[PDB]
């Protein structure tokens, strides 16, 4: 997958080389285009989960960066759902299995920071994570998909 | 029973709901949600109060959707339903029957959690039905 012209094109929308230069309108329009495109590639493959996670992470990022004040609940609910689904699509296959292992060991295994496991537990069972906890965890998850997927996307 | 809960019931579920504007209705919802947020900071607040606040937050976002990408309203609504169900329930289907929680909520929680994100229409149906449920089983008996 990491070589296809389709994912290489998506990488340039989600992670423009251009980025500091580009206007935020243009930036968001490129993000939005990539999100629409992802709906097009929908497999039960690890890559598909990364693409869909990336789409919703940037959906949450724009909502977080656009927050102008007032009630913060909808943006925290949006970001929290995104993080849960991101973690779950990476961890569910083992955790939902007949031979599940402790999530901390399972996260250590795919190099997923424990903060994401803790975030998921809070958003699932406890107080909804705060605005800044959501912003930090959406930022770090974008870092993660980049480190573990997008960085390696290139034409051969 | 408490004055605060009696006041909140009139903001979430006003009498004049038939004859009131979206703006007026939504300003009262936001007042109620900010009040809950305020109670929750200081003191212990019930799950039904917290979920009612987020449910109306999700409802407003759903009704205000006007086109374009629907992902954020669906993510918002899905997280609200998951927490609503989790606070009530944590064999889920069996537990839900015991408390008269429709099975559709367990199925929604599962999809949002583990599979495809539910559709805009599934989100609206669920939020509507969850607001009906907290009325039937909590708010209706406050007076």
Contact A82 B75 (CB under 8 A): yes
Give the per-residue SS3 of chain A: CCCCHHHHHHHHHHCCCCCCCCCHHHHHHHHHHHHHHHCCCCCCCHHHHHHHHHHHHHHHHHHHHCCCCCCCHHHHHHHHHHHHHHHHHHHHHHHCCCCCCCHHHHHHHCCCCHHHHHHHHHHHHCCCCCHHHHHHHHHHHHHHHHHHCHHHCCCC
Confirm or reject contact between B75 and chain A (CB < 8 A): yes
What gap in Å lies between CA A70 and CA A93, rounded to an integer?
Answer: 39
CA distances from A69 to A64, A66, A104, B28, B76 (A): 11, 9, 35, 18, 17
Residues A4, A40: contact at Cβ < 8 Å? no
Compute the nearest-CA separation of B18 from chain A (Å). 26
The A residues from 77 to 136 touching B (CB cutoff 8 Å) are 77-78, 80-82, 84-85, 88, 92, 96, 123-125, 128
**Cα distance between residue B22 and residue B120, in whole Å:** 20
Distances (CA, A) of B3 to A132, B35, B54: 33, 13, 21
Task: Using the structure block, give the residue that is written with the tokens 């029973």.
Answer: B1
Nearest Cβ partner of A78 from B76, B83, B113?
A: B76
Tokens of residue A138, six digits: 């959406």
Q: How many degrees, rounded to 5, is the angle at CA B43 between CA B38 and CA B49? A: 65
CB contact under 8 A, B78 and A81: yes
Contact B53, B33 (CB under 8 A): yes
Q: What does residue A21 show for φ and ψ, rounded to 5 degrees?
A: -65, -40
The residue in chain B having the minimum alpha-carbon distance to the alpha carbon of residue A120 is B113
Which residues in chain B have Cβ-Cβ distances shorter than 8 Å to A74? 57-58, 61, 72, 76
Cβ within 8 Å of B, A 48-67: 55-56, 59-60, 63
The answer to whether residue B142 neighbours chain A at the CB level (below 8 Å) is no
Are B86 and A125 a contacting pair at CB < 8 A? yes
SS (H, E, C) chain B: CCHHHHHHHHHHCCHHHHHCCHHHHHHHHHHHHHHHHHHHHHCCCCHHHHHHHHHHHHHHHHHCCCCCCCHHHHHHHHHHHHHHHHHHHCCHHHHHHHCCCCHHHHHHHHHHHHCCCCCHHHHHHHHHHHHHHHHHHCHHHCC
- C-alpha distances out from residue B113 to B80, B106, B108, B109, Å: 12, 10, 8, 6
CB contact under 8 A, B75 and A56: yes
Task: Tell me the two tokens of residue A129.
Answer: 């994570």
Chains A and B: how many Cβ contacts under 8 Å?
Answer: 72
Residue ranges of domains in chain A: 5-152
B25 min Cα distance to partner chain A (Å): 16
Give CA torsion, residues B134, B136, B139, B142, to 10 deg.
Answer: -150
Overall size of chain B counted in residues: 143
Query: Which residue has tokens 């937050």?
Result: B57
Long-range contacts of B24-31 (CB under 8 A, 24+ apart): B26/B60, B29/B56, B29/B57, B29/B59, B29/B60, B30/A70, B30/A71
Residues of A in contact with B86 (CB under 8 A): 124-125
Report in angstroms the alpha-carbon separations of B51 from A128, A132, B112, B129: 11, 21, 17, 13
CA distance B4 to A30: 46
Give CA–CA dist A156/B91, Å, rounded: 49
Which method, experimentally, gave rise to this model? X-ray
């Amino acid at each position: 997958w990491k070589s296809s012209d389709e994912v290489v094109y998506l990488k340039g929308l989600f992670f423009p080389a251009d980025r500091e230069q580009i206007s935020r309108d243009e930036l968001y329009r490129q993000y939005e285009e990539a999100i629409s495109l992802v709906e097009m590639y929908s497999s039960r493959t690890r890559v598909s989960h990364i693409l869909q996670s990336t789409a919703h992470l940037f959906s949450a990022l724009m909502m977080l960066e656009s927050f102008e004040g007032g009630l913060d609940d909808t943006v925290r609910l949006t970001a929290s759902m995104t993080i849960i689904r991101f973690v779950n699509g990476l961890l569910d296959p083992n955790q939902q299995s007949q031979f599940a292992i402790p999530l901390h060991l399972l996260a250590k295994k795919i190099d997923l920071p424990s903060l994401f496991v803790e975030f998921r537990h809070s958003a699932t069972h406890d107080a909804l994570p705060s605005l800044e906890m959501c912003k930090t965890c959406v930022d770090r998850a974008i870092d993660w998909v980049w480190d573990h997927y997008w960085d390696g996307v290139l034409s051969i």
